[PDB]
CSV table of N, CA and C in Angstrom, one decimal:
chain,number,residue,atom,x,y,z
A,1,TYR,N,74.4,37.0,0.1
A,1,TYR,CA,75.0,35.9,0.8
A,1,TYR,C,76.5,35.9,0.5
A,2,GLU,N,77.3,35.4,1.4
A,2,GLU,CA,78.7,35.4,1.3
A,2,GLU,C,79.3,34.0,1.6
A,3,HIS,N,80.5,33.8,1.1
A,3,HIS,CA,81.2,32.5,1.2
A,3,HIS,C,82.7,32.7,1.5
A,4,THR,N,83.2,31.9,2.3
A,4,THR,CA,84.6,32.0,2.7
A,4,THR,C,85.3,30.6,2.5
A,5,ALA,N,86.6,30.7,2.2
A,5,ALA,CA,87.4,29.5,2.0
A,5,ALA,C,88.9,29.9,2.0
A,6,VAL,N,89.8,28.9,1.7
A,6,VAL,CA,91.2,29.2,1.5
A,6,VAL,C,91.6,28.6,0.2
A,7,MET,N,92.4,29.3,-0.6
A,7,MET,CA,92.8,28.9,-1.9
A,7,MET,C,94.3,28.8,-2.0
A,8,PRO,N,94.8,27.8,-2.6
A,8,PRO,CA,96.3,27.7,-2.8
A,8,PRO,C,96.7,28.7,-3.8
A,9,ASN,N,97.9,29.3,-3.6
A,9,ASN,CA,98.4,30.3,-4.5
A,9,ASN,C,99.1,29.8,-5.7
A,10,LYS,N,98.5,29.9,-6.9
A,10,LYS,CA,99.2,29.6,-8.1
A,10,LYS,C,98.6,30.4,-9.2
A,11,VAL,N,99.4,30.8,-10.2
A,11,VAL,CA,99.0,31.8,-11.1
A,11,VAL,C,97.9,31.3,-12.1
A,12,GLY,N,98.2,30.0,-12.6
A,12,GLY,CA,97.3,29.5,-13.6
A,12,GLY,C,96.1,28.8,-13.2
A,13,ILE,N,96.2,27.9,-12.2
A,13,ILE,CA,95.2,27.0,-11.8
A,13,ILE,C,94.0,27.8,-11.3
A,14,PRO,N,92.8,27.5,-11.8
A,14,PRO,CA,91.6,28.2,-11.3
A,14,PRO,C,91.1,27.6,-10.0
A,15,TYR,N,90.0,28.2,-9.6
A,15,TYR,CA,89.4,27.7,-8.3
A,15,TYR,C,87.8,27.7,-8.5
A,16,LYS,N,87.2,26.5,-8.3
A,16,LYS,CA,85.8,26.4,-8.5
A,16,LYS,C,85.1,26.1,-7.1
A,17,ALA,N,84.2,26.9,-6.8
A,17,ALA,CA,83.4,26.7,-5.5
A,17,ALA,C,81.9,26.6,-5.8
A,18,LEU,N,81.2,26.0,-4.9
A,18,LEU,CA,79.8,25.8,-5.1
A,18,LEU,C,79.0,26.2,-3.8
A,19,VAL,N,78.5,27.4,-3.8
A,19,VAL,CA,77.9,28.0,-2.6
A,19,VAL,C,76.5,27.4,-2.4
A,20,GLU,N,76.2,27.2,-1.2
A,20,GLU,CA,74.9,26.6,-0.8
A,20,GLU,C,74.1,27.6,0.0
A,21,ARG,N,72.9,27.9,-0.4
A,21,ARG,CA,72.0,28.8,0.4
A,21,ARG,C,70.7,28.0,0.6
A,22,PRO,N,70.4,27.5,1.8
A,22,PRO,CA,69.3,26.5,1.9
A,22,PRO,C,68.0,27.2,1.5
A,23,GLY,N,67.1,26.3,0.9
A,23,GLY,CA,65.9,26.9,0.3
A,23,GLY,C,66.2,27.5,-1.1
A,24,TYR,N,67.3,27.2,-1.7
A,24,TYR,CA,67.6,27.7,-3.0
A,24,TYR,C,68.5,26.7,-3.8
A,25,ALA,N,68.5,26.9,-5.1
A,25,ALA,CA,69.3,26.1,-6.0
A,25,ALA,C,70.8,26.5,-5.8
A,26,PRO,N,71.7,25.6,-5.7
A,26,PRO,CA,73.1,26.0,-5.5
A,26,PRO,C,73.7,26.7,-6.7
A,27,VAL,N,74.7,27.6,-6.4
A,27,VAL,CA,75.4,28.3,-7.5
A,27,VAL,C,76.8,28.0,-7.3
A,28,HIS,N,77.5,27.9,-8.4
A,28,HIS,CA,79.0,27.7,-8.4
A,28,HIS,C,79.7,28.9,-9.0
A,29,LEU,N,80.8,29.2,-8.4
A,29,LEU,CA,81.6,30.3,-8.9
A,29,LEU,C,83.0,29.9,-9.2
A,30,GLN,N,83.6,30.7,-10.1
A,30,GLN,CA,84.9,30.3,-10.7
A,30,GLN,C,85.8,31.5,-10.6
A,31,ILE,N,86.9,31.4,-9.9
A,31,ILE,CA,87.9,32.5,-9.7
A,31,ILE,C,89.3,32.0,-10.0
A,32,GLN,N,90.0,32.9,-10.7
A,32,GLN,CA,91.3,32.5,-11.2
A,32,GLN,C,92.3,33.7,-11.1
A,33,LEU,N,93.5,33.4,-10.5
A,33,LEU,CA,94.5,34.5,-10.4
A,33,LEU,C,95.1,34.8,-11.7
A,34,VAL,N,95.6,36.0,-11.8
A,34,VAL,CA,96.4,36.4,-13.0
A,34,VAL,C,97.8,36.9,-12.6
A,35,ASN,N,97.9,37.4,-11.4
A,35,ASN,CA,99.2,38.0,-11.0
A,35,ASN,C,99.4,37.9,-9.5
A,36,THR,N,100.6,38.1,-9.0
A,36,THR,CA,100.9,38.3,-7.6
A,36,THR,C,102.2,39.2,-7.6
A,37,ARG,N,102.0,40.5,-7.4
A,37,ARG,CA,103.0,41.5,-7.6
A,37,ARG,C,103.5,42.0,-6.2
A,38,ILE,N,104.4,41.4,-5.6
A,38,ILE,CA,105.0,41.9,-4.4
A,38,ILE,C,105.7,43.2,-4.8
A,39,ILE,N,105.5,44.3,-4.0
A,39,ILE,CA,106.2,45.5,-4.2
A,39,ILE,C,106.8,46.0,-2.9
A,40,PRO,N,108.1,46.3,-2.9
A,40,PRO,CA,108.8,46.7,-1.7
A,40,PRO,C,108.8,48.2,-1.6
A,41,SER,N,109.2,48.7,-0.4
A,41,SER,CA,109.3,50.1,-0.1
A,41,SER,C,110.8,50.5,-0.1
A,42,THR,N,111.2,51.4,-1.0
A,42,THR,CA,112.6,51.7,-1.4
A,42,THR,C,112.9,53.2,-1.4
A,43,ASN,N,114.2,53.5,-1.1
A,43,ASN,CA,114.7,54.8,-1.2
A,43,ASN,C,116.1,54.8,-1.8
A,44,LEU,N,116.4,55.8,-2.5
A,44,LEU,CA,117.7,55.9,-3.2
A,44,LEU,C,118.8,56.3,-2.2
A,45,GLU,N,120.1,55.8,-2.6
A,45,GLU,CA,121.3,56.2,-1.8
A,45,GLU,C,122.2,57.1,-2.7
A,46,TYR,N,122.6,56.6,-3.8
A,46,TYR,CA,123.4,57.4,-4.7
A,46,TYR,C,123.6,56.6,-6.0
A,47,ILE,N,124.2,57.3,-7.0
A,47,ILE,CA,124.4,56.7,-8.3
A,47,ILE,C,125.9,56.8,-8.6
A,48,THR,N,126.4,56.0,-9.6
A,48,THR,CA,127.8,56.0,-10.0
A,48,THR,C,127.9,55.7,-11.4
A,49,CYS,N,129.0,56.0,-12.0
A,49,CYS,CA,129.3,55.8,-13.4
A,49,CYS,C,130.8,55.9,-13.6
B,295,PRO,N,37.9,11.7,-4.1
B,295,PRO,CA,38.9,10.7,-4.6
B,295,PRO,C,39.4,10.0,-3.4
B,296,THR,N,39.4,8.7,-3.4
B,296,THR,CA,40.0,7.9,-2.4
B,296,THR,C,41.5,7.9,-2.5
B,297,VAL,N,42.2,8.1,-1.3
B,297,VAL,CA,43.6,8.2,-1.3
B,297,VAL,C,44.2,7.0,-0.7
B,298,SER,N,45.2,6.4,-1.4
B,298,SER,CA,45.9,5.2,-0.9
B,298,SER,C,47.2,5.1,-1.5
B,299,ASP,N,48.1,4.3,-1.0
B,299,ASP,CA,49.5,4.1,-1.4
B,299,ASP,C,50.2,5.4,-1.3
B,300,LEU,N,50.4,5.9,-0.1
B,300,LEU,CA,51.1,7.1,0.2
B,300,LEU,C,52.6,6.9,0.5
B,301,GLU,N,53.4,7.9,0.2
B,301,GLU,CA,54.8,7.8,0.7
B,301,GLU,C,55.3,9.3,0.8
B,302,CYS,N,55.7,9.6,2.0
B,302,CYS,CA,56.1,11.0,2.3
B,302,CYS,C,57.7,11.0,2.5
B,303,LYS,N,58.4,11.8,1.8
B,303,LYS,CA,59.8,11.9,1.8
B,303,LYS,C,60.2,13.3,2.2
B,304,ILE,N,61.1,13.5,3.2
B,304,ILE,CA,61.5,14.8,3.6
B,304,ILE,C,62.8,15.2,2.8
B,305,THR,N,62.7,16.3,2.1
B,305,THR,CA,63.8,16.7,1.3
B,305,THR,C,64.9,17.5,2.2
B,306,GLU,N,64.4,18.6,2.8
B,306,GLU,CA,65.4,19.4,3.5
B,306,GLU,C,64.6,20.3,4.4
B,307,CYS,N,65.1,20.6,5.6
B,307,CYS,CA,64.4,21.5,6.6
B,307,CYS,C,65.5,22.0,7.5
B,308,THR,N,65.1,23.1,8.2
B,308,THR,CA,65.9,23.7,9.2
B,308,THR,C,65.0,24.6,10.0
B,309,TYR,N,65.2,24.5,11.4
B,309,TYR,CA,64.2,25.2,12.3
B,309,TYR,C,64.6,26.7,12.4
B,310,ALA,N,63.6,27.5,11.9
B,310,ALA,CA,63.7,28.9,12.0
B,310,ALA,C,62.3,29.5,12.0
B,311,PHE,N,62.3,30.8,12.3
B,311,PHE,CA,61.0,31.4,12.5
B,311,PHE,C,60.2,31.5,11.2
B,312,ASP,N,60.8,31.4,10.1
B,312,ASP,CA,60.1,31.3,8.8
B,312,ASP,C,60.0,29.8,8.4
B,313,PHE,N,59.2,29.6,7.3
B,313,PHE,CA,59.0,28.3,6.8
B,313,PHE,C,60.3,27.7,6.2
B,314,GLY,N,61.0,26.9,6.9
B,314,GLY,CA,62.3,26.4,6.5
B,314,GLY,C,62.3,24.9,6.4
B,315,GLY,N,61.2,24.3,5.9
B,315,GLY,CA,61.2,22.9,5.7
B,315,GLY,C,60.4,22.5,4.5
B,316,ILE,N,60.9,21.6,3.7
B,316,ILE,CA,60.2,21.2,2.4
B,316,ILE,C,60.3,19.7,2.3
B,317,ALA,N,59.2,19.0,2.0
B,317,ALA,CA,59.1,17.6,1.9
B,317,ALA,C,58.2,17.2,0.7
B,318,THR,N,58.4,16.0,0.2
B,318,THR,CA,57.7,15.5,-1.0
B,318,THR,C,56.9,14.3,-0.6
B,319,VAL,N,55.8,14.0,-1.4
B,319,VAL,CA,55.0,12.9,-1.2
B,319,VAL,C,54.7,12.2,-2.5
B,320,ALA,N,54.8,10.9,-2.6
B,320,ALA,CA,54.3,10.1,-3.7
B,320,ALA,C,53.0,9.4,-3.4
B,321,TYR,N,52.2,9.2,-4.4
B,321,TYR,CA,50.8,8.9,-4.1
B,321,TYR,C,50.2,8.2,-5.3
B,322,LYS,N,49.2,7.3,-5.0
B,322,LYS,CA,48.5,6.6,-6.0
B,322,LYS,C,47.0,6.9,-5.9
B,323,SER,N,46.4,7.6,-6.9
B,323,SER,CA,45.1,8.2,-6.8
B,323,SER,C,44.0,7.2,-7.2
B,324,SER,N,42.8,7.6,-6.9
B,324,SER,CA,41.6,7.0,-7.5
B,324,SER,C,41.0,7.8,-8.6
B,325,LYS,N,41.0,9.1,-8.4
B,325,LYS,CA,40.6,10.0,-9.5
B,325,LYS,C,41.1,11.4,-9.2
B,326,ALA,N,41.1,12.3,-10.2
B,326,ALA,CA,41.6,13.6,-10.0
B,326,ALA,C,40.6,14.4,-9.1
B,327,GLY,N,41.2,15.4,-8.4
B,327,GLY,CA,40.4,16.2,-7.5
B,327,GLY,C,41.3,17.0,-6.6
B,328,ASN,N,40.6,17.7,-5.6
B,328,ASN,CA,41.3,18.5,-4.6
B,328,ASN,C,40.7,18.2,-3.3
B,329,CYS,N,41.6,18.0,-2.3
B,329,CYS,CA,41.1,17.8,-0.9
B,329,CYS,C,42.2,18.4,0.0
B,330,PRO,N,41.9,18.8,1.2
B,330,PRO,CA,42.8,19.5,2.1
B,330,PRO,C,43.8,18.6,2.7
B,331,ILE,N,44.8,19.2,3.4
B,331,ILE,CA,45.9,18.6,4.1
B,331,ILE,C,46.0,19.3,5.5
B,332,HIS,N,46.4,18.5,6.5
B,332,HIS,CA,46.4,19.1,7.8
B,332,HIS,C,47.3,18.3,8.7
B,333,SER,N,47.9,18.9,9.7
B,333,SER,CA,48.7,18.2,10.7
B,333,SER,C,48.0,18.3,12.1
B,334,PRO,N,47.3,17.3,12.5
B,334,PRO,CA,46.6,17.3,13.9
B,334,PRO,C,47.6,17.5,15.0
B,335,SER,N,48.8,17.0,14.9
B,335,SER,CA,49.8,17.2,15.9
B,335,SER,C,50.4,18.6,15.8
B,336,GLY,N,50.9,19.0,16.9
B,336,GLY,CA,51.4,20.4,17.0
B,336,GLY,C,52.9,20.5,16.9
B,337,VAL,N,53.7,19.4,16.6
B,337,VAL,CA,55.1,19.5,16.6
B,337,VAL,C,55.5,20.4,15.4
B,338,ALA,N,54.8,20.3,14.3
B,338,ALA,CA,55.1,21.2,13.1
B,338,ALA,C,53.8,21.8,12.6
B,339,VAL,N,53.9,22.9,12.0
B,339,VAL,CA,52.8,23.6,11.4
B,339,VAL,C,52.9,23.5,9.9
B,340,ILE,N,51.8,23.3,9.2
B,340,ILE,CA,51.8,23.1,7.7
B,340,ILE,C,51.5,24.5,7.1
B,341,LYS,N,52.5,25.0,6.3
B,341,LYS,CA,52.2,26.2,5.6
B,341,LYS,C,51.1,26.1,4.6
B,342,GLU,N,50.9,25.0,3.9
B,342,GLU,CA,49.8,24.8,3.0
B,342,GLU,C,48.6,24.4,3.7
B,343,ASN,N,47.4,24.6,3.0
B,343,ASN,CA,46.1,24.3,3.5
B,343,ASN,C,45.5,23.1,2.8
């Protein structure tokens, strides 16, 4: 079974969801960010000193 | 055992080709025992006998 939602982006605040599967006891899940590392694509031009 | 003071409560159901409905009954007995259950109407089929 799968579940979808939207979560606000913040490093510390966790996110608690409660999935429902009819004919079954509900289960809750807990997901928490640790990082968000944007990485750009770069190339060198020259150096100086 | 004589059966009286019945109360049937529907918990949850959903129409699908498998048994997707569950309901509960409260009851006041005369004495312990076993006797069958049945639905004469055809709107729903009873999984149990």
